């Protein structure tokens, strides 16, 4: 964890300062909902990182193909200004 | 309101979390924040519909959470996935 | 000293059978193609319904 | 009782979810458009008619000889607006647009911008084949996926994006 | 067939989503304690003494308007205030849902030509008040001009190949200005020779030459083959 | 693979931590080191900006929340 | 509520806080009584604020002094500075300002290092 | 005044009751809301000074580049505007038309530098404090918010002692010494 | 006629004379030097850069002309 010294955490500006239950079916159902919640959370985190790693290769492929198309267009306007 | 929200505070959260309740569906993506006006209610069955999709008398669990608690194969899937999640997160 | 080739590419008809099969299942995602109608009894569309989305083409 | 820090009050100079993504067509394959088949409906426009006359290619027999099917040339009345507004140097194009083979549509949009009317009533339907000769309109059409378009060149029409041209 | 499902208001007023595991589309019944068609009803209890009110599941495989709804239309004109002229109302398949999405205040003039579906339609119509059964041919709106007054949306589920003349005559006679027009087009019953969106283009052009400006169309493809829901409005003054 | 073989670009398995020194197991390699070192750089950078705020405290720092905070 | 006053006192690195309030006359350093203060030879260096001016001025107040840091002689100078200026501040606020500058005259005539520490040093010659 | 109809809006376009041409976009109103200027005419008694120094820099640029009167008075004016803190660097004489602003000569006022060095938290609260008489610059107290400071006196802007906001912040940090009477 | 406060303002400098413009909705006050015009509820709307002082205002009502001397 982020550990700070006491000599610098006791001396800081104000705004930038690091500032009954049932036994049984109720609590087992609450842990059941906790189970399905962490299931859903790990699942769609997997989904979102998969999408981000997909748009990684999308960005790289698009970047190299726009690079070569931009150089082809620049040699096109180069020869167009060369045929003056 | 917050007088029956104790009874229905779970089931709307799992309906929000329908995407991983059963590993055979993949409902399409929407956030579905809890709406301001809604109402629970049960299906009633067509009188010619019989032997096919009617749930029996002693099979009618009076809550969707109890009906989901019903089948231990679904709960077995919950158990095995939560166990592999627990051992991979510890 | 060849690369790893493919039993799929060995038969010039089969790869066109086995990539038309994919192109069937690809445009299950692009549009929502007809499937055969009401298969069982109607117990819901089994995959969700959303409000703030209309997939209908407007006229300018 | 008197308030602190008062200003002479002036006027405040400043302070006085159905998304729609159009679904792809039922007629469309990946880029094939499996639901255009003879007989075709060919949208026409102004530079196409002028270029066709100055290349002396007939309209209906030219389309039949280019495409080997019965073609129904279709002129929007908004493009007949432009072909009227071109003036008296194109009266030949006018009285060849007035032709009982060339059955004409009816538009509903203010003004007479025929290129936007063409691209709109094409991408609503994807059943038409566009005849044109405009470069920018050609670029709009070959940007939108999978309609065919034709253009006069040499001394016959040529057809761009249609599979069963032979 | 006995589980519990929550309700939620849709975008269009009057129609409700029933979100459960799968999520149905549903409407609020006019005639409680009964199912006309053979659909499933979801009954809720409002808590005063407590009331028991029921909601009929709208089957999109059996009614083209419910196909268009959950295929996604940007707007209807079947609001819970309006009046609805249902051309080609065969049975209580869709007219019951259009009736109880209109509600207890407004009328659905349902027309029909054939006699056997007409008589089971009037036997349906005795049980909910707000629909008006007509047993006339739709080609002659003159012979039922006596009894429908200035409807503010028309729906057309007629399946005979003079649809444009049908909807033109009926909309000229009874549809009020700036009013709604919803068309279901069946290509195989208009003409089987040429393809589907070619006949959709023909019918859209016949609409806008009858000065019904078309705003919107939909193919409803995962439910039925080769139909199109065209929504337009009767302009009648300034088509442009 | 432009002009190279699969046996030219095959694989290079990584050696594991030894068994003699196995009490403090898991020898860490270059990707583990950069995974540790960028985190340590992040923690040192936020410590530096904290020390800078501290020595530029300006002790006339008044708000209204210093009757709930203490 | 109850009338109190908090003062400080600093030798080299030792710091002494003094809570002086109205009371019965008890003087405590970290709960220990004022008599039980080490290193036992500077107990009079601790005593001289309450000894120069007489205990009758201490009869109605009670003092609690926390000390941190420093060694022995730094702690006893911090204690005596905190005691002194706590008594002076209590008499400045709650009772006679004439008694305040009487006490200030007594302490400054004895030594002002019992009221103001000599902080800013050294000198670059 | 009535959100006029289409023909009325066509028949009179140039009407605007709210914003005329000679309001110059209401910039005096806008910047006095921005900097919470109490009195009227303070913008224009700043703008007269801004126009005055660009007039004098115009005349000094007009004077030829060799004589000591011109070069001494231009470096003198540049150092005087640095010493009043209107600038921030001793920059070129082109910044005597790009950089002198009525917003800058407002930005050296007392409540805005008070909010700048976080003494208050908003400039309205700063005018509240220095109208209640809590602050001083060096020895002498400040009662009016029109006192803009110099480059020298951005360091001794501190409250007076027995200012109970000073007492409450010291007792927040519990460094409340009370021998020094605050 | 009915007792209705519309706009009541003490502005510190001297005001020689003032008038209404076309309604109760606008009124121009001739202050110490600059003539100001004001909204119905007392906000100011224009500090006239011209009318470098004023003593007598008037309003020509059909011409919509505020005249100052
Ligand atoms: Zn047009």
From Swiss-Prot, chain B:
Please state where this protein is localized.
Nucleus, Nucleolus
Subunit notes for this chain?
Interacts with FAF1.
State what this protein does: Essential protein involved in pre-rRNA processing and 40S ribosomal subunit assembly. Required for the early cleavage steps of 35S rRNA at the A(0), A(1), and A(2) sites.
The text of the family note is:
Belongs to the FCF2 family.
**Name of the protein:** rRNA-processing protein FCF2
From Swiss-Prot, chain E:
Specify the superkingdom: Eukaryota
Cross-link Glycyl lysine isopeptide (Lys-Gly) (interchain with G-Cter in ubiquitin): where in chain: 64
CC terms in the record's Gene Ontology section? 90S preribosome; box C/D methylation guide snoRNP complex; nucleolus; nucleoplasm; small-subunit processome
Report the principal subcellular site: nucleus
Localization of this protein: Nucleus, Nucleolus
Keywords, comma-separated and alphabetical: Isopeptide bond, Methylation, Methyltransferase, Nucleus, Ribonucleoprotein, Ribosome biogenesis, RNA-binding, rRNA processing, S-adenosyl-L-methionine, Transferase, Ubl conjugation
Name the reaction it catalyses. L-glutaminyl-[histone H2A] + S-adenosyl-L-methionine = N(5)-methyl-L-glutaminyl-[histone H2A] + S-adenosyl-L-homocysteine + H(+); a ribonucleotide in rRNA + S-adenosyl-L-methionine = a 2'-O-methylribonucleotide in rRNA + S-adenosyl-L-homocysteine + H(+)
Give GO MF terms, alphabetically: histone H2AQ104 methyltransferase activity; O-methyltransferase activity; RNA binding; rRNA methyltransferase activity
Region: S-adenosyl-L-methionine binding; residue ranges are 93-94, 112-113, 137-138, 157-160
Entry PTM: Methylated by HMT1, forming asymmetric dimethylarginines (DMA) within a domain referred to as an RGG box, made up of repeated Gly-Gly dipeptides interspersed with Arg and aromatic residues.
Transcription regulation as UniProt keyword: no
Name the EC number(s).
Answer: 2.1.1.-
- Which GO biological process annotations does it have? box C/D sno(s)RNA 3'-end processing; maturation of SSU-rRNA; regulation of transcription by RNA polymerase I; rRNA 2'-O-methylation; rRNA methylation; rRNA processing; snoRNA guided rRNA 2'-O-methylation
What ranges does the record give for the region Helical, renumbered to this chain?
195-227
Q: What is the similarity comment for this entry? A: Belongs to the methyltransferase superfamily. Fibrillarin family.
What name appears for this protein in its UniProt entry? rRNA 2'-O-methyltransferase fibrillarin
Swiss-Prot record, chain F:
Superkingdom of origin: Eukaryota
- Where is this chain compositionally biased, Basic and acidic residues type? 1-9
Give me the ranges of the annotated region Disordered: 1-22
List locations, semicolon-separated. Nucleus, Nucleolus
Family recorded in the similarity comment? Belongs to the UTP11 family.
Assembly with partners or alone = Component of the ribosomal small subunit (SSU) processome composed of at least 40 protein subunits and snoRNA U3. Interacts with snoRNA U3. Interacts with EBP2, FAF1, MPP10, RPS16A and RRP14.
Q: What does this protein do?
A: Involved in nucleolar processing of pre-18S ribosomal RNA.
Q: What protein name does the entry list?
A: U3 small nucleolar RNA-associated protein 11
Q: Which organism is it from?
A: Saccharomyces cerevisiae (strain ATCC 204508 / S288c)
Portion of the full-length sequence here: 2 to 71 of 250
UniProtKB/Swiss-Prot annotation, chain H:
Answer yes or no on keyword Phosphoprotein: no
Supply one GO CC term from the record: nucleolus
Which SMART domains does this UniProt record tie to the protein?
Ribosomal_S4 (SM01390), S4 (SM00363)
- GO process annotations (BP): maturation of SSU-rRNA; ribosomal small subunit biogenesis; rRNA processing
Family label: Belongs to the universal ribosomal protein uS4 family.
Question: What quaternary structure, including any partners, is listed in this protein's UniProt entry?
Answer: Component of a heterotrimeric complex containing IMP3, IMP4 and MPP10. Interacts with MPP10. Component of the ribosomal small subunit (SSU) processome composed of at least 40 protein subunits and snoRNA U3.
Name all S4 RNA-binding domain ranges. Answer: 108-174
Origin species:
Saccharomyces cerevisiae (strain ATCC 204508 / S288c) (Baker's yeast)
Alphabetical list of Gene3D superfamilies matching this protein: RNA-binding S4 domain
Keywords, A to Z, come to:
Nucleus, Ribonucleoprotein, Ribosome biogenesis, RNA-binding, rRNA processing, rRNA-binding
Q: Which residues form a coiled coil?
A: none
Subcellular location(s): the record lists: Nucleus, Nucleolus
- Which one of the record's GO molecular function terms can you name? RNA folding chaperone
Record-given protein name: U3 small nucleolar ribonucleoprotein protein IMP3
Main location as per UniProt: nucleus
Q: What does this protein do?
A: Required for the early cleavages at sites A0, A1 and A2 during 18S ribosomal pre-RNA processing.
